[PDB]
A paper describes a structure:
By contrast, tyrosine was clearly enriched at the +1 position for several regulated preys, including histone H1 and BAZ1B, and peptide SPOT arrays confirmed binding of BRD4 to these sites. We crystallized a K221ac BAZ1B peptide with BRD4/BD1 and observed typical Kac-engagement by N140 in the high-resolution structure, while the adjacent tyrosine (BAZ1B Y222) also inserted into the binding cavity, linking to K221ac via a water-mediated bridge. Although K221ac superimposed well with K5ac in the H4 K5ac/K8ac complex with BRD4/BD1, the peptide backbone followed a different path, which induced structural changes on the surface of the BRD4/BD1 module via side-chain re-alignment of D144, I146, and L148, while inserting BAZ1B Y222 in the same space as H4 K8ac. Taken together, our data suggest that Kac-Y motifs can compensate for the absence of a second Kac, resulting in a similar structural template that fits within the volume of BET BRD sites. Phosphorylation on the longer linker on histone H3 (Kac-X4-Kac; the second Kac being outside of the BRD) affects BET binding, potentially linking cellular signaling events to epigenetic circuits. Together with the discovery of binding to a new Kac-Y motif (>16,000 KY motifs are encoded in the human proteome), we suggest that the BET BRDs can contact a larger target space than previously appreciated.
Bromo and extra-terminal (BET) proteins provide a recruitment platform initiated by the recognition of acetylated lysines (Kac) by their tandem bromodomains (BRD, Dhalluin et al., 1999, Jacobson et al., 2000, Owen et al., 2000). BETs, like all of the 42 human BRD-containing proteins, contain additional interaction domains that recruit other proteins to the acetylated protein target, forming complex assemblies and contributing to processes such as chromatin remodeling and transcription. Direct targeting of BET-BRDs by small-molecule inhibitors such as the high-affinity and pan-BET specificity thienodiazepine (+)-JQ1 (hereafter referred to as JQ1) enables their displacement from Kac.
Numbering used by the authors:
A (entry chain B): 217 to 224
B (entry chain A): 43 to 168
The structure:
């Protein structure tokens, strides 16, 4: 699922 | 800011080319590097570009396949265990920082499965 790491 | 990357050159460090280390480059790293899920792991995490000011506060032994690749190409390691430790550090960092089941973790899990399958045939040291 959509990862926080790339939620810039 | 980003820290300096892990060391890949050190003239005075004891180092070897062994058949096991050759296998780690030719089979293990090559297999993971070409995978569709390699890309997050092919270079140090850029905490500046990704706006992750906590990454290098949490992760104090960063590791990535770009670093591993350079170390193997330079014959920087002393032994296979040191290189295997770098792979395991890379995976563990991912699982520490990212959320279980998130896309980055899923990617690491796929690479780690392949890692484990390839290191099964690590040759006896010659």
């Amino acid at each position: 699922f959509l990862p926080h790491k790339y939620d810039v | 800011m980003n820290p300096p990357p892990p060391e890949t050159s050190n003239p005075n460090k004891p180092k070897r080319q062994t058949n096991q280390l050759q296998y780690l480059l030719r089979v293990v790293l090559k297999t993971l590097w070409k995978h569709q899920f390699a890309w997050p792991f092919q270079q140090p995490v850029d905490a500046v570009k990704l706006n992750l000011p906590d990454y290098y506060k949490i992760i104090k032994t960063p590791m990535d396949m770009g670093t591993i690749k350079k170390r193997l190409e330079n014959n920087y390691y002393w032994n296979a265990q040191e290189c295997i430790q770098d792979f395991n550090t890379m995976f563990t960092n991912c699982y520490i920082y990212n959320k279980p089941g998130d896309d980055i973790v899923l990617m690491a899990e796929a690479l780690e499965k392949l890692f484990l399958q390839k290191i099964n045939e690590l040759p006896t040291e010659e």
